[PDB]
Amino acid sequence: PLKYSYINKCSRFLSDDRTEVPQLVNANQYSPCVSIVPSTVWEDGDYYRKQLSPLEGGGWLVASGSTVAMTEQLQMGFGITVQYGTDTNSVCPKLEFA
Amino acid sequence: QVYNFKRLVFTNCNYNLTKLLSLFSVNDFTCSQISPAAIASNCYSSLIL
Amino acid sequence: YVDVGPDSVKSACIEVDIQQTFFDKTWPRPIDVSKADGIIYPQGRTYSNITITYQGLFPYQGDHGDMYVYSAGHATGTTPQKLFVANYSQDVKQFANGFVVRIGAAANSTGTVIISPSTSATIRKIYPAFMLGSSVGNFSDGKMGRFFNHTLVLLPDGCGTLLRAFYCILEPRSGNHCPAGNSYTSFATYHTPATDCSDGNYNRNASLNSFKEYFNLRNCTFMYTYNITEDEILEWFGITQTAQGVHLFSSRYVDLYGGNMFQFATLPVYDTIKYYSIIPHSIRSIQSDRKAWAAFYVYKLQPLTFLLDFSVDGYIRRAIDCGFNDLSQLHCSYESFDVESGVYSVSSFEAKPSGSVVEQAEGVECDFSPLLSGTPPQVYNFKRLVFTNCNYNLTKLLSLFSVNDFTCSQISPAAIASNCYSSLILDYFSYPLSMKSDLSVSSAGPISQFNYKQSFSNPTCLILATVPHNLTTITKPLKYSYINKCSRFLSDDRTEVPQLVNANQYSPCVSIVPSTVWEDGDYYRKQLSPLEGGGWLVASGSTVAMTEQLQMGFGITVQYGTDTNSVCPKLEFANDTKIASQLGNCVEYSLYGVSGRGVFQNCTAVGVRQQRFVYDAYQNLVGYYSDDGNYYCLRACVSVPVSVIYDKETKTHATLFGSVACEHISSTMSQYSRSTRSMLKRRDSTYGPLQTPVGCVLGLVNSSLFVEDCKLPLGQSLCALPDTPS
Incomplete structure (x- = not known):
């Protein structure tokens, strides 16, 4: 990546300009704020906004982010989850039945 | 980026995860509930x- | 990306006319959960x-569903004509944990054409098409239902034997009657039996190509297809x-x-x-070859629990929605479809919510009265009032002047x-109105240069206004004045350094200038001490003639607390219903942070007065002294216990509301204890409440007979009787 980046804020402003609604990410779901945030954060502490649709009652989407310097070797992470079942268990370790 | 995740759903298939482990150096391995x-x-x- | 194939070449489309009044029909289909x-x-x-x-996840038993009816387009003579469709494209719904549908329920029967219904054509099964996604919005013509980024498309193609699924980005077309065009009405799709579905060559791409005529496919990431065979039997599908x-779910492959x-x-x-x-x-x-299509239904899934009557072949043959009524609740408590006869308790009514009652300290107000008397200061001599922790109404404050300038920065x-x-x-x-061109935080004028400035670190405002003839305690300066110069001569008596006024601060030159400027162009000088580095303070000023009504200016700044925002425009029920007290039913409340749901009543007073909240040994709020000096008592809110009478022989039932009495009982309730009360209406639609010594009941009848043992005795001498044998 040109820089490693992350969103360090995700909330929506209330339409009355006095309060704000936080938006923590839901498990196994993209944060709603991704719709406004750029594929990378151009500068540390950048923030973005989008007006909410009238179907949402108005107010503004808000998000902000931060970056980390690129490194000699790429660094990455993984998340693993599994799902239990009975006759749906077709994912398996390679097997030998000899 | 941390908000852009790729996902792979695996069904009907066979695996050997140690083959994948050989491809990277692991600097953190922790599993919850298993x-x-x-x-x-x-x-x-x-x-x- | 996926090989969907080429875009249709023409950008043109067939016009879509909305004919929705033809499609109003009443043909409800409630779920038969016992099937x-x-x-x-x-x-x-x-x-x-x-x-x-x-x-x-399952549908409610009482849901009649949403009904949609597909129809033939306009045609005349022997040829096709511009389309006549329903307004269904605008019906956006929020997704709500999936849905199920019925297809073919009206098969092997007859109905009408709908769009030209007088023909009375027989009706046949048709497969539905759908669009799903994460966002919606307006089309460029303001039309409803545009979707964004990638969406699901569920589209049958040609005959019902071929089905396809897609995940792609749609692109609008600029052609006549198409989505980027301004002749667009609404999106629709079509099939043409004249060449589509030949018996030696079914047209596998038919409906997709008519879909392509309104939207270009771009960036497509998935396509799938399925094989179906025809069958006039009803099918279930869902997501x-x-x-x-x-x-994806279906009944077709297995059952x-x-x-x-x-x-x-x-x-x-x-x-x-x-x-x-x-x-x-x-x-x-063709107009004489049109065929009517079968009704189609949609129901939404919910997080319910059910009894399921499995067959020995594992098919569910019968089921019980536990929450649909209290008989169904009784069945779920015994995990069976045949509960023994008896009288049984069921869950109580919750009573009902009522609007809130709140009491908190009031009269905050904000010290703003100094503005109404004496002579206001010259703009370089401006007076400031700081307010924290207090209640205000600036729009009321500003109705004391006619405002000839109301502007602000960053707010x-x-x-x-x-x-x-x-x-x-x-x-x-x-401040004279003649100087208004010079009053901005950005102004080039001498007022912003030397008299008054506001910080750009806070939202700020500027107001010009004039005094009403009824503010007689306000008085005016002999002339309006301002400083039009403020600098210090450098100690070498040739170099000079200007002193622009500091934000939110008096100019240093105010120390030499008089409280008003006696004449236009007056100037003053002050020698400066060696501690100042020497030099001379120098300043000058200018004036504007006094006017019939005083003219004034104001500055406002604010600081928003991160969590310290204690100054607010609180009003004492101005423009409000006045929920200081209600007397009242079960109104929810907040009394200085004490809260709950309950009823207050005007009763005697017990001590100790001024403790406000009266409690019992269980710390229950017994009652409350209000700011009106009255003691009210709090009784929370009574609920209504209910039990039912179940006769397994006749498979009928009746209900006892007991102690509630028939004075609160009505044909419908606004309480409530269960999904429906229609379980009683099965007979109760023709009867009123029956008050008894034990309590109000429904469906009981006054037979005044004498029976030794009715098995389903209600206690006392008030036993109810079952119907006679078949």
Whole structure:
């Protein structure tokens, strides 16, 4: 990546300009704020906004982010989850039945 | 980026995760609610990465 | 990306006319839960003929569904004509944990054409088309239902034997009657039987190509297809979504006759669906060859639990929605479809909510009265009032002057009045309207240069206004004045350094200039001490003639607390219903942070007075002294216990509301204890409440007979009787 980046804020402003609604990410779901945030954060502490649709009652989407310097070797992470079942268990370790 | 995740759903297929382990140096391995050996040996309705 | 094939070459489309008044029909189809209608089979397991409880997503038993009817388009003579369709493209719904549908329920029967219904054509099964996605919005002509980024498309192609699924980005077309064009009305799709579906060559791409005529495919990431065969029998289909992706269900592959749904397929897309719509479609057949189409239904899934009557072949043949009525609740408590006769308790009515009652300290106000008397200061001499922790109404404050300039920076002028802040600060001074061109934080004028400035670190405002003839305590300066120079001569008596006024601060030159400037162009000088580095303070000023009514200017700044915003525009029920007290039913409340739901009443007073909250040994709020000096008592809110009478021989029932008495009992309740009260209306639609010594009942009848043992005795001498033998 040109820089490693992350969103360090995700909330929506209330339409009355006095309060704000936080938006923590839901498990196994993209944060709603991704719709406004750029594929990378151009500068540390950048923030973005989008007006909410009238179907949402108005107010503004808000998000902000931060970056980390690129490194000699790429660094990455993984998340693993599994799902239990009975006759749906077709994912398996390679097997030998000899 | 941390808000852009790629996902792979795995069904109907066979695996050997140690082949994947050879491809990277692991600097952090932690599994919740399951031993790491077991998750490698367990068979599942799905595997998600 | 996926090889969907080429874009149709023409940008042109067939015009879509909305004919929606033709499609109003009343043909409801409530779920027959005892036939297992709409039941999705459990995942991955099967069972014996033993009845078991189960939890999963299912439709409510009482839902009649949403109905949609597909129809032929306009045609005349021997040829096609511009389309006549329903307004279904605008029906966006929020997604709500999936849905199920009925297809072919009206097969092997007759109806009408709908769009030209006088022909009375027979009706046949048709497969539905749908669009799903994470966002919706306006089309460029303001039309409803445009979707964004990638969406699901569920489209049958040609005859009902071919089905396709897509995940792609739609692109609008600029052609006549198409989505980027300004001749667009609404999106629709079509099929043409004249060349489509030949018996030696079914047209596999037919409906997709008519879809392509309104939207270009771009960036497509999935396509799938399925094989179906024709069958006039009714089918069930549906959708769910999980973190493993979207799943598809049908009764067709496994249970053609019983109708139980099974998970036919799954999809790789796990992107959240927030919205749902149905795509309108039409037949392009010749006017005398048109055929009417069968009714189609939609029901939404819910997190319910059910009894399921498995067959020895594992099909669910019967089911009980536990929450649909209290008889169904009784069945779920015994896990069976045949509960023994008896009198049984059922859950109580919750009573009902009522609007809130709140009491808190009032009269905050904000010291703003100094502005109404004496002579206001010259603009360089402006006076400031700081306000924290207090209540205000600036729009009331500003009705004391006619405002000839209401502007602000980094806040709208309306918003600063309604916004709460950690502090509110007001500056005021006399100011002629003739100088108004020079009053801005950005102004080039001498007022911004030397007299008054506001920081750009806080929202600020500037107000010009004049005094009403009824503010006689306000008085005016002999002339309006301002400083038009402020600099210090450098100690070498040739170099000079200007002193522009500091934000939110008096100019240094105010120390030499008189409280008013006696004449235009007056100037003053002050020698400076060696501690100052020497030099001379120098300043000058200018004036404007006094006027019939005083003219004034104001400055406002605010600080928003991160969590310290104690200054707010609180009003004492201005423009409000006045919920200081209600007397009243079960109104929810907040008394200085004490809260709950309950009823207050005007009763005697017990001590100790001024403790406000009266409690019992269990710390229950017994009652309350209000700020009106009256003691009210709090009784919370009574609920209504209910029990039912179940006669297993006749398979009928009746209900006892007991102690509630028939004075609160009515044909319908606004309480409530269960999903429906229609279980009693089965007979109660023709009867009123019956008050008894034990308590009000429904469906009981006054027979005044004498019976030794009715088995279903209600206690006392008030036993009810079952009907006679068949």
